[PDB]
Design a protein around this ligand. Structure first.
Ligand SMILES: [Zn+2]
Lengths: 116, 140, 101, 50, 112, 151, 59
RNA sequence: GCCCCAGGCGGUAGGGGAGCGUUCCCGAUGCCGAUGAAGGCCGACCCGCGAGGGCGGCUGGAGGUAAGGGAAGUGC
RNA sequence: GUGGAGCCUGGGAGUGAGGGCGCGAGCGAUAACGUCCGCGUCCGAGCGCGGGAACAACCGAGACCGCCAGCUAAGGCCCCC
RNA sequence: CGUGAGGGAAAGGUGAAAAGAACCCCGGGAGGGGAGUGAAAUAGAGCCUGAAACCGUGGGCUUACAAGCAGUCACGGCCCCGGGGGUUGUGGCGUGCCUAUUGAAGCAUGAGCCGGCGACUCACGGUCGUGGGCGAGCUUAAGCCGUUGAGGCGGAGGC
């Protein structure tokens, strides 16, 4: 019984190519180029999953450092403050406070220096 | 709870005295204000740092023998087209271009960086045509 | 009035009448949950240190859900190493009822 | 018992070890033959016994 | 309403005639007749015949008034390339693809 | 394959990829590698296994009550509707695929056209046709050759 | 002369890029002041066969 | 004791294990099919870690085929 | 000392071009990203991750996955960062 | 194609039925539009369906201070369907694949791209394991007889 390629190769290609929509040029038109582009896109997606967390953490540390310096202290001193103060709100929430709750974040400064 | 992004904010002008301050340090703080990383609403992917104007760029000061031992060089692409320029001559000609070079050395690259450099305005001497923009004086 | 709560090793600024997703908690849908409050965000700005003393939010679970299928897919080059793998992280999406003082 | 009830015992019938079918099979690009060598070539070695 | 004629299986380089046809897209009918009439290109004759057959179909077949006849849209797809041999040097042979074209003109009435 | 062994073009300097003749299994039209050949799939199953398993099938249908030894076929005499009135009266509907085993050519020939009946001489008894049909039906003599065959 | 050869295939965008400038400008015509027919300037209107308000060609 | 506990899970050659899919066989004188098969294209729908499977829309117009097993010219 | 520990017997292997690094030697010129050995290591196969600007073997560290959580390693905290 | 021995192609499919498009118009014709048949004509004879590569035409987003293995993450903007989907402006990160190598992004090999063909099997012995039968026993070969897909006999012989 002969089992030609039949429909398999075509269908698999349509899978990878439909995944390759929106790529520049042959990277979204040829199955071969689209395959390889989807490989590198895969590892990219992985290391950017792992990356994005450190990324937003750097954002949070930046904005929080801004709000802290606008009260006379800096990021390291402030974090040492809260850590000494037994406060455990994290970088994201301190960021959204320092943007949205300048008064609340202000009191966070007051207890940070309160540790001092 | 996504991280907050601010809406578009009008850039707040800032005047800075070039006089009496060290080149590298002053350029540092200039770049800092330029990035807008003094603002809690900071975001990297958008230029929301403040406009900056400086006067008395000639009045900058630099440590040691850097007056002459620092050679701003350029390159024309032509053979032997490496044009070395000492710091003194560059002061006599284009001190504002001195600060331009120093702060541009500190800005993040990319089109955002170039637009940020556009966001800066140097003026050697004590004056500048931006009183209409309300240049807020800010000591550093 | 808001408050930052702890959950799944995560901290959430929350306010009453809000739908929020968290780690897949274990609780029957329709049931409610009381949560550690890291800080009362609002008028009575109390600093939970490390948690508020008597406060805790009240959140009814809406139901357990599966996140959109992440296609984590590792790949090494020149080694014939391909790894296609789906992933749909379950979420316990909630409803902020109120914030017990 | 109807024909669709008939089945071998578990493990009574076993897969073959199909080779050369990409990475996911784990038996790919080489058919387990390793890299270059007289053994990895078609035909193989001489009589290994002798 | 729309009209259209098709130069199905026209032996002419489709790329070439596309240059012509991209000179009347978005034009009024009479303007098209002139521009084809004095365009220094071989394809302009073919596009001219396809044009007039088109507009005739509009008035005759589809009964569109000749007043508002502007080129609604037109183009030239490719036909079966007649492959021929060209003897090249050192005995080697090649194949010139004498390219056949399809021409399609569409005539809408420019209202307002 | 019907081609020849003449090398299509030389080994080197021709610019093309190396090839031998077009009879190779890599050209369209070339031969097939490892293609199926005349292959005798038959093999000697153990006698004790054939016999024993046969008895196990008959035990299957028997203990399930789908077995029905029959002595007489007075309704059938070589005509189909004879077998219809018989088997219908014989407690058979047509829904039960029934394995028919007998030595009466009048029975077998008289009922082969039944879409739901599987007819077999008593010698042709075997596990497969026993498993095919819901109900099994045999004559006492067919039962006997069964017994000796399972004896 | 060692037979220069195209290193890679030209992408579609680059091919179309060079083909940007290949537009065919419309041959400017004007109406014949004799017969009101469009025609290229500085030539006898083949419709009227006139030119400069006078007959030249024998249409 | 079907769930809980502890630990484990970079990975080539290579060993092993478990599945997915293709043609054909039995199931099947059955079943699905003009109220539309196969096939093609489309999907932001559901299922599985995946191989993939359904589901739905259109094109297509006549074949397809389970559960559960068998055999391979089986996966580019 | 319970460990993807050990031992025995069978089955299938692949490998028998290795390399860098440190240390101990020879050759070498106490030259070589050199060669040849021993010991350890890593890469190979971990060109997965952070640092080292970039960089397989140097420092940290052995990647099941997801999280817009936290503590830290080498290394850094003047801007780029 | 080869002087010749010889080598050796490609190339199937309308429709149930030609009912194969009378006739009208544009057109030198071709071809086109109508009309007409047709269940259907993107079934029109270059005809089942009709994929991709490729080639156009429209629509949406976007793009001319600008840097890049073409992606990925975030944010944002626009467009659309109503929470999503399409575009990507910026910012961050990011050395194609295969083979062969200690070592490849490699300026080492292969690959223009798409579609299809394409490579671990079969036979017979041996060996290990195993799912089963039997068990100091196990087992049939050829052949014979049966159906015409049904099996049994057959102890020669082997272990
Ligand atoms: Zn005139």
């Amino acid at each position: 019984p002969r089992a030609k390629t039949g429909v398999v190769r075509r269908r698999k290609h349509k899978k990878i190519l439909k995944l390759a929509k929106g790529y520049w040029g042959l990277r979204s038109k040829s199955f071969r180029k689209a395959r390889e582009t989807l490989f590198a896109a895969g590892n990219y997606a992985y290391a950017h999953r792992k990356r994005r967390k450190r990324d937003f953490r750097r954002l949070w540390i930046v904005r929080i450092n801004a709000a802290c310096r606008q009260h006379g202290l800096n990021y390291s001193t402030f974090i040492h403050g809260l850590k000494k103060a037994g406060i455990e709100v994290d970088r994201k929430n301190l960021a959204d406070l320092a943007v949205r709750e300048p008064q609340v974040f202000a009191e966070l400064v007051e207890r940070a220096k309160a540790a001092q | 709870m996504k991280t907050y992004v601010p809406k578009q904010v009008e850039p707040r002008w800032v005047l800075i005295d070039a006089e009496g301050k060290t080149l590298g340090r002053l350029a540092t703080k200039i770049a800092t204000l330029l990035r807008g990383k003094h603002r809690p609403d900071w975001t990297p992917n958008v230029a929301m740092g403040d406009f900056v104007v400086v006067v008395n760029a000639d009045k900058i000061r630099v440590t040691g023998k850097k007056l002459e031992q620092k050679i701003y060089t350029r390159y024309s692409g032509y053979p032997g087209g490496l044009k070395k320029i000492p710091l003194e001559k560059m002061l006599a000609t284009h001190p504002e271009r001195v600060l331009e070079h120093a702060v541009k050395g500190m800005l993040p690259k990319g089109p955002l960086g170039r637009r940020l450099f556009k966001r800066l305005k140097v003026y050697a001497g004590p004056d500048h045509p931006h009183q209409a923009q309300r240049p807020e004086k800010l000591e550093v | 009035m808001f408050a930052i709560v702890k959950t799944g090793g995560k901290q959430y600024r929350v306010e009453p009448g809000l739908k929020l997703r968290v780690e897949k908690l274990d609780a029957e849908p329709g049931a409610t949950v009381e949560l550690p409050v890291l800080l009362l965000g609002g008028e009575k700005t109390v600093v939970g240190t490390p948690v508020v003393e008597g406060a805790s939010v009240v959140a009814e679970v809406l139901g357990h859900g599966r996140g959109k299928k992440i296609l984590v897919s590792k790949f090494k080059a020149k080694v014939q190493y391909r790894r296609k793998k789906g992933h749909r992280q379950p979420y316990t999406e909630l409803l902020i009822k109120e914030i017990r003082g | 018992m109807k024909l669709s009830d008939l089945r071998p015992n578990p493990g009574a019938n076993k897969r073959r070890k199909r080779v050369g079918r990409g990475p996911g099979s784990g038996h790919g690009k080489t058919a387990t033959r390793g890299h270059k060598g007289q053994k990895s070539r078609s035909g193989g070695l001489k009589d290994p016994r002798r | 309403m729309e009209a259209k004629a098709i130069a199905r299986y026209v032996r002419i380089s489709p790329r070439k005639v596309r240059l012509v046809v991209d000179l009347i897209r978005g034009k009024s009918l009479e303007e098209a007749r002139n521009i084809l009439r004095y365009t220094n290109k071989r394809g302009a004759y073919f596009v001219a015949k396809v044009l007039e057959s088109a507009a005739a179909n509009a008035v005759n077949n589809h009964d569109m008034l000749e007043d508002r006849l502007y080129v609604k849209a037109a183009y030239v797809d490719e036909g079966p390339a007649l492959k021929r041999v060209l003897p090249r040097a050192r005995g080697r042979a090649d194949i010139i693809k004498k390219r056949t074209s399809h021409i399609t003109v569409i005539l809408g009435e420019k209202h307002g | 394959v019907a081609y020849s062994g003449r090398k299509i073009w030389p080994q080197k300097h021709t610019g093309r990829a190396r090839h031998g003749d077009i009879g190779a299994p890599i050209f369209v039209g070339g031969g097939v590698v490892f293609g199926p050949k005349p292959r005798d799939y038959s093999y000697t199953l153990p006698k004790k296994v054939r016999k024993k398993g046969l008895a196990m099938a008959v035990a299957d249908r028997a203990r399930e009550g789908k077995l029905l030894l029959v002595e007489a076929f007075a309704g059938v005499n070589g005509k189909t509707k004879e077998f219809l009135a018989w088997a219908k009266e014989a407690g058979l509907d047509g829904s039960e695929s029934v394995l028919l085993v007998t030595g009466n050519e009048l029975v077998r020939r008289a009922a082969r056209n039944l879409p739901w009946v599987v007819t077999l001489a008593p010698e042709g008894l075997n596990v497969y046709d026993i498993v095919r049909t819901e109900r099994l039906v045999m004559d006492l003599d067919a039962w006997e050759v069964f017994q000796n065959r399972i004896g | 002369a060692k037979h220069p050869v195209p290193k890679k295939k030209t992408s579609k965008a680059r091919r179309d890029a060079r083909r940007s400038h290949h537009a065919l400008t419309p041959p400017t015509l004007v109406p014949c002041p004799e017969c009101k027919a469009m025609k290229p300037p500085h030539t006898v209107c083949p419709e009227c066969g006139y030119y400069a308000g006078r007959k030249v060609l024998e249409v």
